[PDB]
Amino acid sequence: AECSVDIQGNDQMQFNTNAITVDKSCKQFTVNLSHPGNLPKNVMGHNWVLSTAADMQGVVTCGMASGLDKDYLCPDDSRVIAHTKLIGSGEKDSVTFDVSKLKGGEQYMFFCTFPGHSALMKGTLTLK
Ligand SMILES: [Cu+2]
């Protein structure tokens, strides 16, 4: 089983994957996020945030006004299944979550909540 994925967010507003597969035999799944660019996090910060497709817009909106010092996420927001911190150029963060948190018939999305990023920085996550 492959129970981790490495993801990059760059200075051109791109994640390097659009779709993440979580092998259902994994008890835990890990995302290792890094930022290959030169731009600092107040200009081009990225996080990796997971929610159901239905919840994505609310999480993104709640985040846009939570501000930079809250990593553009509403604190202790239970719609967020898992998230990293907001990182800038040359930084990295990882998150590990319980695969039991994923419902098998549900649609999940991952995205960055830095204001405006999620138009491009989004993809699917699928338990299979
Ligand atoms: Cu971003």
Side-chain angles (χ1 to χ4, degrees), residues 18-35:
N18 303 326
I20 294 164
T21 293
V22 176
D23 181 328
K24 62 186 198 187
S25 79
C26 299
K27 290 288 168 197
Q28 307 92 228
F29 189 78
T30 299
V31 175
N32 299 133
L33 180 68
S34 61
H35 192 320

mmCIF file of all heavy atoms in Angstrom, residues 18-35:
data_model
loop_
_atom_site.group_PDB
_atom_site.id
_atom_site.type_symbol
_atom_site.label_atom_id
_atom_site.label_comp_id
_atom_site.label_asym_id
_atom_site.label_seq_id
_atom_site.Cartn_x
_atom_site.Cartn_y
_atom_site.Cartn_z
ATOM 1 N N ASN A 18 -3.517 16.669 -9.646
ATOM 2 C CA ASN A 18 -4.961 17.021 -9.620
ATOM 3 C C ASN A 18 -5.830 15.996 -8.949
ATOM 4 O O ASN A 18 -7.045 16.197 -8.797
ATOM 5 C CB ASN A 18 -5.531 17.146 -11.039
ATOM 6 C CG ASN A 18 -4.809 18.139 -11.852
ATOM 7 O OD1 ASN A 18 -4.336 19.155 -11.338
ATOM 8 N ND2 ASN A 18 -4.734 17.884 -13.151
ATOM 9 N N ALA A 19 -5.239 14.866 -8.577
ATOM 10 C CA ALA A 19 -6.031 13.761 -8.084
ATOM 11 C C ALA A 19 -5.199 12.878 -7.187
ATOM 12 O O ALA A 19 -4.183 12.373 -7.626
ATOM 13 C CB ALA A 19 -6.559 12.940 -9.235
ATOM 14 N N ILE A 20 -5.688 12.660 -5.980
ATOM 15 C CA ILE A 20 -4.993 11.835 -4.991
ATOM 16 C C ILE A 20 -5.793 10.589 -4.716
ATOM 17 O O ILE A 20 -6.973 10.672 -4.477
ATOM 18 C CB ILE A 20 -4.757 12.618 -3.669
ATOM 19 C CG1 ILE A 20 -3.800 13.773 -3.888
ATOM 20 C CG2 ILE A 20 -4.178 11.718 -2.591
ATOM 21 C CD1 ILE A 20 -3.827 14.800 -2.764
ATOM 22 N N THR A 21 -5.132 9.434 -4.765
ATOM 23 C CA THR A 21 -5.768 8.169 -4.431
ATOM 24 C C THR A 21 -5.314 7.739 -3.042
ATOM 25 O O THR A 21 -4.123 7.645 -2.794
ATOM 26 C CB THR A 21 -5.361 7.102 -5.447
ATOM 27 O OG1 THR A 21 -5.931 7.470 -6.694
ATOM 28 C CG2 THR A 21 -5.842 5.709 -5.047
ATOM 29 N N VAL A 22 -6.276 7.445 -2.178
ATOM 30 C CA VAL A 22 -5.984 6.878 -0.854
ATOM 31 C C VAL A 22 -6.401 5.411 -0.830
ATOM 32 O O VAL A 22 -7.580 5.082 -0.901
ATOM 33 C CB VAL A 22 -6.720 7.622 0.247
ATOM 34 C CG1 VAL A 22 -6.482 6.943 1.577
ATOM 35 C CG2 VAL A 22 -6.318 9.102 0.259
ATOM 36 N N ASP A 23 -5.409 4.541 -0.734
ATOM 37 C CA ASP A 23 -5.632 3.102 -0.668
ATOM 38 C C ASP A 23 -6.366 2.783 0.637
ATOM 39 O O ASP A 23 -5.863 3.076 1.723
ATOM 40 C CB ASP A 23 -4.280 2.404 -0.801
ATOM 41 C CG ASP A 23 -4.367 0.882 -0.768
ATOM 42 O OD1 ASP A 23 -5.252 0.315 -0.096
ATOM 43 O OD2 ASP A 23 -3.541 0.280 -1.468
ATOM 44 N N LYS A 24 -7.574 2.211 0.530
ATOM 45 C CA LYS A 24 -8.452 1.979 1.694
ATOM 46 C C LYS A 24 -7.814 1.042 2.726
ATOM 47 O O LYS A 24 -8.221 1.032 3.872
ATOM 48 C CB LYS A 24 -9.847 1.436 1.301
ATOM 49 C CG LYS A 24 -9.865 0.087 0.604
ATOM 50 C CD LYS A 24 -11.283 -0.376 0.088
ATOM 51 C CE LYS A 24 -11.258 -1.900 -0.173
ATOM 52 N NZ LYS A 24 -12.467 -2.514 -0.814
ATOM 53 N N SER A 25 -6.820 0.264 2.320
ATOM 54 C CA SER A 25 -6.111 -0.573 3.282
ATOM 55 C C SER A 25 -5.155 0.217 4.209
ATOM 56 O O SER A 25 -4.676 -0.315 5.211
ATOM 57 C CB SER A 25 -5.370 -1.688 2.583
ATOM 58 O OG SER A 25 -4.178 -1.250 2.022
ATOM 59 N N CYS A 26 -4.862 1.466 3.871
ATOM 60 C CA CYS A 26 -4.103 2.340 4.782
ATOM 61 C C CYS A 26 -4.901 2.716 6.020
ATOM 62 O O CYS A 26 -6.035 3.166 5.902
ATOM 63 C CB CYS A 26 -3.726 3.638 4.053
ATOM 64 S SG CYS A 26 -2.689 3.414 2.602
ATOM 65 N N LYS A 27 -4.325 2.581 7.216
ATOM 66 C CA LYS A 27 -5.006 3.086 8.411
ATOM 67 C C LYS A 27 -4.865 4.611 8.500
ATOM 68 O O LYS A 27 -5.797 5.312 8.913
ATOM 69 C CB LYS A 27 -4.468 2.418 9.687
ATOM 70 C CG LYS A 27 -4.845 0.964 9.840
ATOM 71 C CD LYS A 27 -6.309 0.768 10.178
ATOM 72 C CE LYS A 27 -6.721 -0.686 10.037
ATOM 73 N NZ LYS A 27 -8.222 -0.870 9.955
ATOM 74 N N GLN A 28 -3.704 5.116 8.087
ATOM 75 C CA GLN A 28 -3.402 6.545 8.102
ATOM 76 C C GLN A 28 -2.873 6.935 6.718
ATOM 77 O O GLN A 28 -2.296 6.106 6.008
ATOM 78 C CB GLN A 28 -2.325 6.901 9.142
ATOM 79 C CG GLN A 28 -2.591 6.424 10.557
ATOM 80 C CD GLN A 28 -1.989 5.024 10.864
ATOM 81 O OE1 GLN A 28 -2.684 4.192 11.407
ATOM 82 N NE2 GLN A 28 -0.687 4.784 10.538
ATOM 83 N N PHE A 29 -3.070 8.190 6.329
ATOM 84 C CA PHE A 29 -2.543 8.672 5.068
ATOM 85 C C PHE A 29 -1.807 9.972 5.334
ATOM 86 O O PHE A 29 -2.272 10.768 6.117
ATOM 87 C CB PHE A 29 -3.696 8.899 4.065
ATOM 88 C CG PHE A 29 -3.213 9.183 2.664
ATOM 89 C CD1 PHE A 29 -2.770 8.154 1.859
ATOM 90 C CD2 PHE A 29 -3.189 10.500 2.152
ATOM 91 C CE1 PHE A 29 -2.286 8.387 0.577
ATOM 92 C CE2 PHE A 29 -2.721 10.724 0.848
ATOM 93 C CZ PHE A 29 -2.271 9.654 0.065
ATOM 94 N N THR A 30 -0.673 10.174 4.665
ATOM 95 C CA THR A 30 0.199 11.307 4.871
ATOM 96 C C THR A 30 0.394 12.077 3.578
ATOM 97 O O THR A 30 0.663 11.515 2.536
ATOM 98 C CB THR A 30 1.576 10.833 5.385
ATOM 99 O OG1 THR A 30 1.403 10.162 6.652
ATOM 100 C CG2 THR A 30 2.548 11.985 5.537
ATOM 101 N N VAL A 31 0.261 13.381 3.689
ATOM 102 C CA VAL A 31 0.620 14.329 2.634
ATOM 103 C C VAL A 31 1.821 15.145 3.081
ATOM 104 O O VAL A 31 1.793 15.795 4.126
ATOM 105 C CB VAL A 31 -0.541 15.298 2.363
ATOM 106 C CG1 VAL A 31 -0.142 16.373 1.348
ATOM 107 C CG2 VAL A 31 -1.772 14.499 1.936
ATOM 108 N N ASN A 32 2.855 15.112 2.250
ATOM 109 C CA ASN A 32 4.067 15.894 2.466
ATOM 110 C C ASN A 32 4.054 17.055 1.465
ATOM 111 O O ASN A 32 4.254 16.855 0.260
ATOM 112 C CB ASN A 32 5.322 15.040 2.234
ATOM 113 C CG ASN A 32 5.428 13.858 3.168
ATOM 114 O OD1 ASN A 32 5.711 12.696 2.728
ATOM 115 N ND2 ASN A 32 5.218 14.109 4.438
ATOM 116 N N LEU A 33 3.811 18.269 1.975
ATOM 117 C CA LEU A 33 3.707 19.440 1.134
ATOM 118 C C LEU A 33 5.020 20.236 1.167
ATOM 119 O O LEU A 33 5.632 20.443 2.246
ATOM 120 C CB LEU A 33 2.565 20.310 1.641
ATOM 121 C CG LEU A 33 2.320 21.598 0.866
ATOM 122 C CD1 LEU A 33 1.783 21.264 -0.545
ATOM 123 C CD2 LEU A 33 1.390 22.571 1.590
ATOM 124 N N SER A 34 5.447 20.726 -0.006
ATOM 125 C CA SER A 34 6.622 21.587 -0.076
ATOM 126 C C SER A 34 6.364 22.714 -1.084
ATOM 127 O O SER A 34 5.378 22.660 -1.819
ATOM 128 C CB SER A 34 7.866 20.783 -0.481
ATOM 129 O OG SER A 34 7.711 20.185 -1.753
ATOM 130 N N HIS A 35 7.223 23.737 -1.079
ATOM 131 C CA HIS A 35 7.013 24.936 -1.890
ATOM 132 C C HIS A 35 8.311 25.283 -2.601
ATOM 133 O O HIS A 35 9.122 26.023 -2.058
ATOM 134 C CB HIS A 35 6.553 26.064 -0.977
ATOM 135 C CG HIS A 35 6.033 27.271 -1.692
ATOM 136 N ND1 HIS A 35 6.599 27.789 -2.841
ATOM 137 C CD2 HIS A 35 5.003 28.097 -1.371
ATOM 138 C CE1 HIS A 35 5.926 28.867 -3.208
ATOM 139 N NE2 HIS A 35 4.952 29.080 -2.332
#
